[PDB]
Amino acid sequence: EMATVKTTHRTIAGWDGTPLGAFVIEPQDAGGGRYPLLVMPSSWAVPSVEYVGVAQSLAQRGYVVISYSSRGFWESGGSIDIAGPSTVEDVSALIDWALDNTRADPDRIGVSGISYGAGTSLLAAARDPRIKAVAALSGWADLQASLYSNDTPSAQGIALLVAAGLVTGRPGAELATINRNVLAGNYQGAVDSLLPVAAQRSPAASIDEINANQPAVFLANAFNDSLFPPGQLVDFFNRLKGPKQLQMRHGDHALNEALGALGIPNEVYDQVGDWFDHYLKAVANGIDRQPAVQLKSQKGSWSSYPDWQATSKGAVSYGLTAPSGLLLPTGGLAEHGGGTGWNYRIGSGLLTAANSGVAMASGALQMINLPPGAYVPFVGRSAAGVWQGPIQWSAKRLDGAPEVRLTVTPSRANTTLYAYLYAEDVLGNGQLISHKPYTLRGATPGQAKTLDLRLEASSWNLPAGSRLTLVVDTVDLRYAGISQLGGAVTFTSPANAPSVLKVPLH
């Protein structure tokens, strides 16, 4: 049965003596061996989000749990350093405190957190070989890849990082510099300020250290996370050599749940509990035999794979054909397989309906993104290339990351491209499955460049009556793109390197 637990608030010194506000949660046995230890850095102070409650529910499975506010948070001393070396070292300091002051088992230590605490936890697992298991929710592996994907600043990601920070605590120098840049609309400057110190804040840069330490790593993110897109997390997951599981879902806001305002359903920490129970309490619950990749579609049904490479088995290659039409020039997506030698010119810097997200209000703390639909017949063909596949007469499932190869010729040295994959119904209404930005800065005008874009991973049930539609344009409401009205982009498909969309259908 579940442990009765006692919760005590106290202040625990960090590595340098900085006082951290902590809830120490301890089973009451009593007679009465040691319990596995979980150290759990809380995340952003979003209203209604119950971090300590989540920690208590884990402790009730039979764990000592330390739920705490990182340096700089309201309840702690210090400054927020964006999961910098001090914040990460503090996890080790709290492990040491727990081993000396609670009935914690030094041989059975795990760490778990969400978002700020997820990145912190993974970094701690790289730096502290005592950690045997990690569960990181809605986190990152590569901070640069997350906020500056293909050299395109994620304006709404960066803005959200600032907004979340301002409700959570007192910024250190790095975050205050970001805040100052964002206030001016200077997203590129925000990025430039962070890049030199981003690698030490990125689990991906510590992949060898985590693999050496071989903790059991559980990752669970939303495909539509507003801060940290899935590709960078998948790439990290794929490189882990030890026990591991990746679960990806579509997020939505649940009401009256501990984590519903973060877009995380209660089922995630249910699975985390099972993960730790196996790896830290040797419970024979079969989690060791479960597939390493588990994906939940937008309709809420699960699929699974033994590894990420399996998602791409038998991917369909659609060749892009030359856009044609009297009124609405549109190309095809042609399975075996397309045209070469064509050219299609659009103007850069023009607005279209195809966007990754809506214009969003100053200070909003929405942690998942709900892309607007786009009516494909109103996507301006002088502003975008549009390629449509055939209407399906049977349901299909897309699981994985689509890839696009496209050759582009800019007339300006600076252009940003955006590729979007839509499920388009028979009437023309598109729901966005995936997208990716790509900035060409300092390109040679008039020189064709072949680009390989990997769109963000997704899991999507495509119903009978729908088709896949690719849109490529040059502006997006969520990114600080550098395209200029008056410039041009010409799409081509050279015989040597045809323009192709690869889609992982199942």
Which residue in 234, 243, 236 sits closest to 134, CA to CA? Answer: 243
Question: Strand pairing partners for 248?
Answer: 221, 295
Pick the last residue of a domain from 290, 323, 354: 290
- Looking at the domain assignment, is residue 300 inside a domain? no
CA 402 and chain centroid, separation: 16
C-beta neighbour count of 235 within 10 angstroms: 18
71 and 215 in a single domain? The answer is yes
Residue 257 and residue 372 in one domain: no
- 54 domain-assigned: yes
Whether 165 and 55 map to the same domain: the answer is yes
Question: What is the DSSP code string of 25-45?
Answer: EEEE--S---EEEEEEE----
CB 150: neighbour CB atoms within 10 A? 17
- What region, left, alpha or beta, does residue 446 occupy, with left being phi > 0 and alpha being psi -120 to 50 degrees? left
Least Cα distance to 66 among 115, 124, 122, 110 occurs for 110
377: Cβ contacts below 8 Å, ≥ 6 apart: 328, 428
Task: Say yes or no: 280 and 375 in one domain.
Answer: no
Last residue of a domain, one of 255, 290, 325: 290
Q: For residue 318, what are its two tokens?
A: 């659609």
At 106 the three-state DSSP class reads strand
The reply to whether 299 falls in a domain is no
Number of compact structural domains in the chain: 2
Joined tokens for residue 389? 């596949």
Task: Tell me, yes or no, whether 346 lies in a domain.
Answer: yes
Classify 69 as helix, strand or coil.
coil
Q: Is residue 304 part of a domain?
A: no
Q: Do both 328 and 228 map to the same domain?
A: no
From 258, 290, 322, give the residue that closes a domain. 290
- Give the CATH number, domain containing residue 351: 2.60.120.260
Both 123 and 168 in one domain: the answer is yes
Residues 276 and 324 occupy one common structural domain: no
CATH of the domain at 63: 3.40.50.1820
Same domain, 284 and 414: no
Is residue 261 domain-shared with residue 352, that is, in the same domain? Answer: no
CB 424 within 8 A of CB 388: yes
Task: Kindly give the pairing relationship between strand 104-114 and strand 131-137.
Answer: parallel
CB 306 within 8 A of CB 293: yes
425, part of any domain: yes
| CA end-to-end span of the chain | 42
Solving technique for this entry?
X-ray
Q: Confirm whether 372 is domain-assigned.
A: yes
- Domain encompassing residue 190: 4-290
- Whether 335 and 384 share a structural domain: yes
Domain shared by 278 and 330, yes or no: no
For residues 221 and 135, state if they share a domain: yes
Which of these, 213, 165, 156, 214, lies nearest to 185 by C-alpha position? 156
DSSP per residue, 342-404: -EEEEETT---S--SS----TT----B--PPPEEGGGS-TTT-EEEE-PPPSS-EEEEE--EE
Residue 461 lies in a domain: yes
Distances (CA, A) of 295 to 59, 309, 410, 501: 28, 14, 38, 22
Chain position carrying tokens 């499955």:
433
